[PDB]
Amino acid sequence: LEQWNLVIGFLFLTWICLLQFAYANRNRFLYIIKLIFLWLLWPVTLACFVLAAVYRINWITGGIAIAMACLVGLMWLSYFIASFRLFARTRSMWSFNPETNILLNVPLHGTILTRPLLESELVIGAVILRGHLRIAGHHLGRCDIKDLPKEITVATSRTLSYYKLGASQRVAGDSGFAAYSRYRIGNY
Amino acid sequence: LEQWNLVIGFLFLTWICLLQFAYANRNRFLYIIKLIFLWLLWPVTLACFVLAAVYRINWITGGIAIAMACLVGLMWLSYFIASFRLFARTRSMWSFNPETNILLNVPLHGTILTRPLLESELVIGAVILRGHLRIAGHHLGRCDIKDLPKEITVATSRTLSYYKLGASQRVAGDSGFAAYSRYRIGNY
């Protein structure tokens, strides 16, 4: 049974190792690895509760573990049905993340890049670092001040909020810094 | 031995429960709870490796677990000595966090609020949401457009970077949005 303990040790060790390089340098491969890695936390939690409930000798702790496993499974299925409700409308793979059900669509370089967004703030920042665009902690790619998006969107079940570009601030040679004020909330 | 399994189940359940309320509404109490909660991940990882190594029957897996426990302990002590090197200069409690060793000092309402900062970007955003100031995901407090800081600092072992306020953008009634361009890097 120590194999599962060594597996959780490997998981914890690599997750700790994730907190020295990937937190600063944001790569799409590393981000999606971290995302699917957080998505697998729910089944391993359920597995821990299951292996706690299999060896039931007394009924108090076993009943507590069974009730909590039922609750966490119910809320996991609630999250699954929420992600299904989102994906039935926005039709985006990033709607199946365990982080949030709030989507950010940015039309950069023609392709619509979709990223998870924390809370859909009324004003959304856009920061240019050495010609690289980042919005809400997501490095969308290499976009200098000339090709900045004009209008982006925030997608949600029965909600689409349009965000219009504000003023652009050219400073420190090539770095730029701009705001997205909320325009309107619709569902056509 | 199932008590430790139920403890890790409680930890995972409450950490999953943390991903529905505290991620959107940022409270200082909830943030510091999450911070000390991430700080206790290192000893529980070491404990998992220790309980994997105590029941050594074969030598291959036991040796692998012992070597990995030694490596994770060595890097944990490296992190401890890094935090000590930081705290010997900046003298701030927030230097003892497992997230980052990059400090952000903001002079808001007279008191110098210090927060962890991800990577010390050359341009730092400041967003006003309903009269509340947030910088790099940290809700520093209630600060409208009038009392915005003039100059903030980023603290680091043998580094202090001064950040000067840029242009201020008043939009949507009371919301504001401003930039901190890097001024100079010193250590006096």
Author numbering:
A (entry chain B), B (entry chain A): 17 to 204
Q: What's the publication's text?
A:
SARS-CoV-2 encodes four structural proteins incorporated into virions, spike (S), envelope (E), nucleocapsid (N), and membrane (M). M plays an essential role in viral assembly by organizing other structural proteins through physical interactions and directing them to sites of viral budding. As the most abundant protein in the viral envelope and a target of patient antibodies, M is a compelling target for vaccines and therapeutics. M forms a 50 kDa homodimer that is structurally related to the SARS-CoV-2 ORF3a viroporin, suggesting a shared ancestral origin.
We reconstituted homodimeric SARS-CoV-2 M in nanodiscs made from the scaffold protein MSP1E3D1 and lipids (DOPE:POPC:POPS in a 2:1:1 ratio) and determined its structure by cryo-EM. The majority of M (189 of 222 amino acids per subunit) was de novo modeled in the cryo-EM map. Each subunit contains an extracellular or lumenal N-terminus, three transmembrane helices (amino acids 17–36, 43–71, and 79–105) connected by short linkers, and a β-strand rich C-terminal cytosolic domain. The two subunits assemble along their long axis, with TM1 from one protomer forming extensive interactions with the TM2-TM3 unit of the second protomer. The inner sheets from each protomer interact through a large (~690 Å2 buried surface area per chain) and complementary interface with residues L138, V139, V143, L145, F193, A195 contributing to a hydrophobic core surrounded by additional polar interactions. Second, the M pocket is completely sealed by protein to the surrounding membrane and cytoplasm; no openings large enough for water passage are observed connecting the pocket and protein exterior. In M, the gap between subunits is confined to the region between cytosolic domains because transmembrane helices from opposing subunits form tight interactions across the entire lipid bilayer. The cytosolic domain of M is strikingly electropositive across nearly the entire exposed surface. Taken together, these data suggest that M adopts a stable structure with minimal dynamic rearrangements on the microsecond timescale, at physiological temperature, and in the absence of additional binding proteins. Our data suggests that M in a simple lipid mixture predominantly adopts the short form.
